[PDB]
Enzyme design. Structure first.
Site, short mmCIF file in Angstrom:
data_model
loop_
_atom_site.label_atom_id
_atom_site.label_comp_id
_atom_site.label_asym_id
_atom_site.label_seq_id
_atom_site.Cartn_x
_atom_site.Cartn_y
_atom_site.Cartn_z
N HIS A 1 0.73 -1.24 0.26
CA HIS A 1 0.00 0.09 0.14
C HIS A 1 0.80 1.26 0.13
CE1 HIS A 1 -4.06 1.71 0.07
NE2 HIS A 1 -3.64 2.52 0.59
N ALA A 2 0.45 2.10 -0.79
CA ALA A 2 1.39 3.47 -0.99
C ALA A 2 1.30 4.29 0.24
CB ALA A 2 0.80 4.11 -2.33
N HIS B 1 0.06 12.21 -4.94
CA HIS B 1 -0.31 12.34 -3.77
C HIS B 1 0.60 11.98 -2.77
CE1 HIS B 1 -3.23 11.46 -0.62
NE2 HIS B 1 -2.55 10.32 -0.20
N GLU B 2 1.49 11.07 -2.94
CA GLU B 2 2.41 10.72 -1.97
C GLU B 2 3.83 12.02 -1.69
OE1 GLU B 2 2.12 8.34 0.18
OE2 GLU B 2 0.52 7.46 -0.50
N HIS C 1 2.59 14.58 0.40
CA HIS C 1 3.23 14.33 1.95
C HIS C 1 4.43 14.60 2.04
CE1 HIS C 1 -0.36 12.32 3.20
NE2 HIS C 1 -0.30 11.37 2.34
N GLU D 1 -3.51 14.96 3.41
CA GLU D 1 -4.03 14.02 2.33
C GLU D 1 -4.18 14.95 0.94
OE1 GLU D 1 -3.52 10.99 2.50
OE2 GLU D 1 -3.41 11.03 4.74
N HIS E 1 -7.72 -0.06 4.87
CA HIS E 1 -7.69 0.66 6.08
C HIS E 1 -8.44 0.25 7.24
CE1 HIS E 1 -6.72 3.15 2.40
NE2 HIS E 1 -6.49 4.19 3.22
N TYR F 1 -9.95 11.70 3.90
CA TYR F 1 -9.91 11.52 2.48
C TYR F 1 -11.36 12.36 2.03
CZ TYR F 1 -6.49 7.80 3.08
OH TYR F 1 -5.54 7.11 3.44
#
Ligand SMILES: *[C@@H]1O[C@H](CO[C@@H]2O[C@@H](C)[C@@H](O)[C@@H](O)[C@@H]2O)[C@@H](O[C@@H]2O[C@H](CO)[C@@H](O[C@@H]3O[C@H](CO[C@H]4O[C@H](CO)[C@@H](O)[C@H](O[C@H]5O[C@H](CO)[C@@H](O)[C@H](O)[C@@H]5O)[C@@H]4O)[C@@H](O)[C@H](O[C@H]4O[C@H](CO)[C@@H](O)[C@H](O)[C@@H]4O)[C@@H]3O)[C@H](O)[C@H]2NC(C)=O)[C@H](O)[C@H]1NC(C)=O
Ligand SMILES: Cc1ccc([C@H]2CC[C@@H](C(=O)O)N2C(=O)CNC(=O)[C@@H](S)Cc2ccccc2)cc1
Ligand SMILES: *[C@@H]1O[C@H](CO)[C@@H](O)[C@H](O)[C@H]1NC(C)=O
Ligand SMILES: [Cl-]
Ligand SMILES: [Cl-]
Ligand SMILES: [Zn+2]
Length: 586
Positions: free
Chosen positions: A314-315, A344-345, A348, A372, A474, A484
């Site tokens: 999972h990313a 997305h990552e 972060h 997020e 999750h 989210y």
């Protein structure tokens, strides 16, 4: 008194940097390499960090925060008073860490097998089936099989998980774990605010749902699609029907305006996972934001291992709490969905870098939804036909209205379809935590919400022992989900504000903020705040006002709403699922 509090936070910050860095390293090694050894040491480092948390959290609870004048110090100490799982007595803490680890491991290694045949992992194998098969029975095999093997195997752990996570929350002054999670937003009106935002998006979702249901009726047949009922949950291109973009080919608004498939063009042109993250890094630096350090490229895991290791695929993004080591762990596949995940990552990582000079207690996003949202904002610009063509992944569109409505549909299948799913996951979990849903009706109450919010029905009737929530990452990994929903609303607010800062005029969905230094400056000033101030201040720095609002998302999709209303009216669609008790006969 005030001097004792300041000395305390100084000592907490120094010691926490060391301990948290050591914990992050050990957690990284289990996640990159699921073995019995790394399991045991991860569970050991859990005891080191718990000792630290209990030492300093006990000291922090000796301060009457009411008498402290400095608000920053008040804020840090109040937060250090929450021990989280380290409030549990020693036997319960060991059991809880073991249970979390067992749930994560069970999810990560589950497989679905054909008799005397191959065994499929979730990623890439079953995900690929869900995205590409157009055979009702083959989709059903993957959808049911994953719930049979992942979901049913999590059920044995989940009641004890609920008991322990609630006990920790009560020992930190909350009434249950859901109360603890909601408190991260520091917003007394949270539940009402989120409900109002959900209701504002209902016109878009109901019209998209009705249009997609009609298209599914055309492909899968009248005997399998009820035009006044909920949609079978396995036909939307995605294992959880949380995003619908993979059935774009079944619902194209204007088939006479065809488009290159992004994924197909990436492979034809030799894109690699590394290139995907390099493009994300270039977008951030084009805004004047920070580049990822060289250490990131050396230490990150940007593709699934080739040497047999079981991993969590999972990313995720990792802060090692020394202000220099930041990493992504992603089993990256070369396609458009993972290009967006990569952005997305990287958002972060950018947040980590922007707030790295704050005390570690304040090294978090303004609220969990802000964390997020950052990368998703840039990916909205990346996804425009103009930007994709500049990447050589799309031919030139040229302002064609048909291409424009086709693009908006593609975006809606991702963003609008996700809104009700992201709302309902923690509606379910908040009610498990507060005791309203017991283990006797975990699954039934999940499906009641899947129906009420998403308008979906299971293709196969559920049976005792099913635990379909367990088949969603999750849930076994105990990652909150309302972040989210918040993220998907505010990312459109941020896009609109940044587009205005860059001087864009005309329709919001045509905006691309690439290379806008003014847009970068808005983001950076807010991200530097970390968690040091209530989140409305960061909202104000980015957007010029302090509230969450769906108006930007509605503005973005307005041309699509108009088209969908005219199309649905032409065909006489009954919006919603008045025949809400319909389920598939065969
Ligand atoms: C309430 O207390 C607040 C917190 O006080 C701080 O913590 C307590 C526990 C004690 O240690 C205090 O001595 C300490 O100040 C207080 O808020 C602080 O207010 C001061 C100003 O009075 C701010 O200081 C600014 O910091 C800027 C740079 O910040 C970081 O820079 C370093 C790296 O670049 C970093 O190392 C450094 O220290 C941090 O390091 C580690 C990183 O690992 C971190 O974990 C640790 O906790 C440290 O925080 C620091 O954070 C400077 O640029 C800035 O200078 C500005 O002004 C100059 C002109 O005079 C200009 O040249 C320049 O361009 C700048 O504009 C200034 O020194 C401090 O950042 C701030 N802290 C926080 C957390 O907000 C607050 O003022 C108190 N309120 C009242 C009413 O008294
Ligand atoms: C194209 C795209 C874009 C964004 C996402 C996000 C939103 C939906 C959710 C999901 O896929 O359902 N989703 C992730 O899961 C991403 N990954 C994390 O958000 C990590 S950063 C969370 C995490 C995980 C483990 C430990 C700590 C934190 C999915 C797909
Ligand atoms: C994976 O884990 C095993 C057992 O802990 C260890 O011997 C090996 O070195 C690890 N591999 C990597 C690449 O770290
Ligand atoms: Cl499900
Ligand atoms: Cl959250
Ligand atoms: Zn994330």
């Amino acid at each position: 008194d005030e001097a004792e509090a300041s000395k305390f936070v100084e000592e907490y910050d120094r010691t926490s940097q060391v301990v948290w860095n050591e914990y992050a390293g050990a957690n990284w090694n289990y996640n990159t390499n699921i073995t019995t050894e790394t399991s045991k040491i991860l569970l050991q480092k859990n005891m080191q960090i718990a000792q630290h948390t209990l030492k300093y959290g006990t000291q922090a609870r000796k301060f009457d925060v009411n008498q402290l004048q400095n608000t920053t110090i008040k804020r840090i100490i109040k937060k250090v008073q929450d021990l989280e799982r380290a409030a549990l007595p020693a036997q319960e803490l060991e059991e809880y860490n073991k249970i979390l680890l067992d749930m994560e491991t069970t999810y990560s290694v589950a497989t679905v097998c054909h008799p005397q045949g191959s065994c499929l992992q979730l990623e890439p194998d079953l995900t690929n089936v869900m995205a590409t098969s157009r055979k009702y029975e083959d989709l059903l095999w993957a959808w049911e099989g994953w719930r049979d093997k992942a979901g049913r195997a999590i059920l044995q752990f989940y009641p004890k998980y609920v008991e322990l996570i609630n006990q920790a929350a009560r020992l930190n002054g909350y009434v249950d774990a859901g109360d603890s999670w909601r408190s991260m937003y520091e917003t007394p009106s949270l539940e009402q605010d989120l409900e109002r935002l959900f209701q504002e998006l209902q016109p878009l979702y109901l019209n998209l749902h009705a249009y997609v249901r009609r298209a599914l009726h055309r492909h899968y047949g009248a005997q399998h699609i009820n035009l006044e009922g909920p949609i079978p949950a396995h036909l939307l291109g995605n294992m959880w029907a949380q995003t619908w973009s993979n059935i774009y080919d079944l619902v194209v608004p204007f088939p006479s305006a065809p488009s290159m498939d992004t994924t197909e063009a990436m492979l034809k042109q030799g894109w690699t996972p590394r290139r995907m993250f390099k493009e994300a890094d270039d977008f951030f630096t084009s805004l004047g934001l920070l580049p990822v350090p060289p250490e990131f490229w050396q230490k990150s895991m940007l593709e699934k291992p080739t040497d047999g290791r079981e991993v969590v695929c999972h990313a995720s993004a990792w802060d090692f709490y020394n202000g220099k080591d930041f990493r992504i762990k992603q089993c990256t596949t070369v396609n458009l969905e993972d290009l967006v995940v990569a952005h997305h990552e990287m958002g972060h990582i950018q947040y980590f870098m922007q707030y790295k000079d704050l005390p570690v207690a304040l090294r978090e996003g303004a609220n969990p939804g802000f964390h997020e949202a950052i990368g998703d904002v840039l990916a909205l610009s990346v996804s425009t036909p103009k930007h994709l063509h500049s990447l050589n992944l799309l031919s030139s569109e040229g302002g064609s209205d048909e291409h424009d409505i086709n693009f908006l549909m593609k975006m809606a299948l991702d963003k609008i379809a996700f809104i009700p799913f992201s709302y309902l996951v923690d509606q379910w979990r908040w009610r498990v935590f507060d005791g309203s849903i017991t283990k006797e009706n975990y699954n039934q109450e999940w499906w009641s919400l899947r129906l009420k919010y998403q308008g979906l029905c299971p293709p196969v009737p559920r049976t005792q022992g099913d635990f379909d929530p367990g088949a969603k990452f999750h849930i076994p990994s105990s990652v909150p989900y309302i972040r989210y929903f918040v993220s998907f609303i505010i990312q459109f607010q941020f896009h609109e504000a940044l587009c205005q800062a860059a001087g864009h005029t005309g329709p919001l969905h045509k905006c691309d903020i690439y290379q806008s230094k003014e847009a970068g400056q808005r983001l950076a000033t807010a991200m530097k705040l970390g968690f040091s101030r209530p989140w409305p201040e960061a909202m104000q720095l980015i957007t010029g006002q302090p509230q969450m609002s769906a108006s930007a998302m509605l503005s973005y999709f307005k041309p699509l709403l108009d088209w969908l209303r005219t199309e649905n009216e032409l065909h006489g669609e009954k919006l919603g699922w008045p025949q809400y008790n319909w389920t598939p006969n065969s």
